[model samples]
Target: VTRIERIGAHSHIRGLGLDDALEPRQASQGMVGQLAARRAAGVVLEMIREGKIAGRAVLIAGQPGTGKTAIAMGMAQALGPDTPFTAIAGSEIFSLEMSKTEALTQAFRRSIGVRIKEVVHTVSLHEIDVINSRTQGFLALFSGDTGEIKSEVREQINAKVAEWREEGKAEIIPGVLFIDEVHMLDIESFSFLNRALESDMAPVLIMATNRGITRIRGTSYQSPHGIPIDLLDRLLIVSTTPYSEKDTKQILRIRCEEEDVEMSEDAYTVLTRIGLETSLRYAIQLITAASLVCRKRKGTEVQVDDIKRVYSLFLDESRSTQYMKEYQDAFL
Candidate 1:
């Protein structure tokens, strides 16, 4: 086997930071803000474990950067890697060549768990290597790859599933499907879900979006979060409020530690204030820039001027807007 490691912007997010009693932690597992939303999803996580929440949907409503995706990721982590958790963007449906409902149905099927013979077939194998014409040797497996199937094969599989079910030797473990930027979905997909969720077998759907009351995509109708009211009524909605000053400060400190950057208390507070004034995402992006500037000044710890220097070097959204207003006529 080969071991490889990589990191991304959200690789640090681990879980909901909840205790055994589902109490929210101030800071834990690389998660810093959105305490209530995280706790709410934690409750849903408990319901999911009971296997009584199939065909139900959870809506994470928030403004941008309010940690909607973080809560979803946390719940995914808390559920553990063995649980079938599928993540997809709402825009993905439109990009694929298949019918929108077909694409969505395909994704939903992936989140389902099939158990047969009442024994653990825990590993999914992807590839096999052979040494000779009649030799059997070591085996290797790959995950996260999907393949197409013929209807005849599907029929045989379904027959076996039915046999196992009648003999009480099989189970279906419904999993979670997290759809980010759900507002990007059109009306048709919403209609598809409305019917799909009522089926006997369906996965738990968790959708996150940053839109408020707005026009539904591909139509003139106005609705909250750009989702149809019928589908919206079926969702158990959880709202994420904006982070407080202390929350922002705590979040900045977490980022600094994750990035291995040391910063003075004054600089940290300044960065927090900037986050509050401009935006949290912009402030988070500023950390690496400020650290680089600090290194250029031969300072081991990031200082207030290092932040200021980068703030001036890279303009925030508000500053960028002001600059645009002043020079609108000069550009095409």
Candidate 2:
């Protein structure tokens, strides 16, 4: 794996330099449209500073493959490496010992009843897996297990905080909890999340969901099962849109540079046109297909014909009716 070194005037950092092999580099695109989103993050940070949003929640809403999870991960990465973060899935809460569940539940109840007079410490990042919403009943049987897990996790977190305190770490840096695909969360799990966020515990909570509205509610809102109106009112919402043609082209160029591949200008133009009409996802697939075609032909450089071949693969016969429209209109 390649390692990229990021150095500042006074500091240096290194990251594992392997590209996500499955999806193209979606998050590596230039930082142009993130201004508003960053601003929103800043506002949430400010709220934390003033104790208004402390241990509060945030939600990122968007369609599938629109980079909602990437944005959340990016924000977490931006918040200095020193920040403690934990990612937990909604389903993982149910992974527990049946015999210990009741005892754990009792401990959680006791802990919650007490007012945190001393400094409450430790921030955790959790990723809530909600993909298996069909097993809500099986998960409900583990509610007691969740309470126990939280209680135990909190104790360890507090111990760490105590250690940091003894080391004279006075700054109130909160822990972050990230939940992906919140829309798929079962009703019971979502309700549990709502309660946890209401507690204003040590960790700051952020969730992402594809469902923007509840059909029963007739409004673009989070489901009451996971985050009720009262709790939802406290969260900052970030909305993501599908990538544009310009973004796709820039991404392609960046990917090519990173991969040490060269493409003709005409090839890039054709790929950009295809991306505009379909999606950036298509652009990435086409680029990969073209690269394969070039390699098979014993060529080092990608040409316009390779791009045309990949484009044709994406279109059915009927959709290809305008296959030669641009060429015919311009050169016929």
Candidate 3:
């Protein structure tokens, strides 16, 4: 049997920084109303754990605030320590002189996690050199050699997989590359991402966007998400819908617990009403603001009066709560 003796300092695997973003959850923990998307994530995760679908690109399409990012975060929480997850906005590539492709390439490079294996011979034969391979997919390729699955990081993973496969060893190096706001990517950059996915050393790609069959920019035509249809074609599409009012309240309740905020039942009802009237995000904000008002009023638990006092300010900046209605069913 091959002893996993201190191979060398160079053999140590690198970090992908995904754990920081992922919260530990029970198996029953689930997203609010995105059951289909949740199931989709589970199936893909199964593939990722087995390394069969590594480097495959997955597109998460949905309306805004429909728990898209939350799904990726939940997936990250479900992953192991070795799994790396990197998150980036699609619009993040813009700025000065560098080509968009180059910027994305740099982003991809930063997101990857590398694992080095030494096929220590020790006068060994194939059976003696057993390798237990376990590759973790962070929301990060979907590090990933991170921001991973679509670029050179995948190229590197391809090389590594080949190296280990020929030796038939056990390995479970983990990682994930995540891209939020995926529709913001330009066509040229998407092409670059598409090309890399076709290579042998690709990582899993998990992407989220608010485009529901939208028009593509830089061209007169339309596509599923403004991204090239080819790239979309390659993506295993998952659509996320808006959360129900009940689900929204449950999520808020969890957040309150996390923040350790004590609010009266009436206040909770008020916040839930605001969430349904406006957006869930805006309603959640009411929680923290209410807490501040509670402290100032010389009270312990937040009162409905405190929440009402602060709610107008929210509308002043955000306009009326009717936006939730207008933006409903709109993607991107």
Best candidate according to lDDT: 1
Candidate 2 residue lDDT tens string, 1-332? 54584322111111111133312233443322334454555555444435434457788777665656556655555554555445554344444453223332222222211112237543222211111123452363344333323445545654654565466653344556666665555444544555555554335677777774563122344564344565567677877776666666766676565555689988888878876766665676676678888998999889989988877667633455565674676645
**Candidate 3 lDDT by residue in tens digits, 5-94:** 542211211211122323222223534445677777776666666765446888888888787777777667666656556678888777
Clashes per model (N, Cα, C within 3 A):
0, 17, 41
Per-residue accuracy of model 1 over 215-265 as CA lDDT, tens digit each: 999999999899999999999999999999988898888888878899999
Candidate no. 3 TM-score: 0.70
Model 1 alpha-carbon drift over 4 Å, by segment: 1-7, 116-159
Name the lDDT value of residue 135 in candidate 3: 39
RMSD of each: 5.3, 11.5, 11.8
Candidate 2 lDDT score at position 120: 50
Pitting candidate 1 against candidate 2, the one with the higher TM-score is 1
Candidate 3, residue 315: how far the Cα is off, in Å: 2.2
State the local distance difference test value for candidate 3: 0.64
Arranged by lDDT with the best first, the candidates are 1, 3, 2
| TM-score sort, best first | 1, 3, 2
lDDT of each: 0.79, 0.52, 0.64
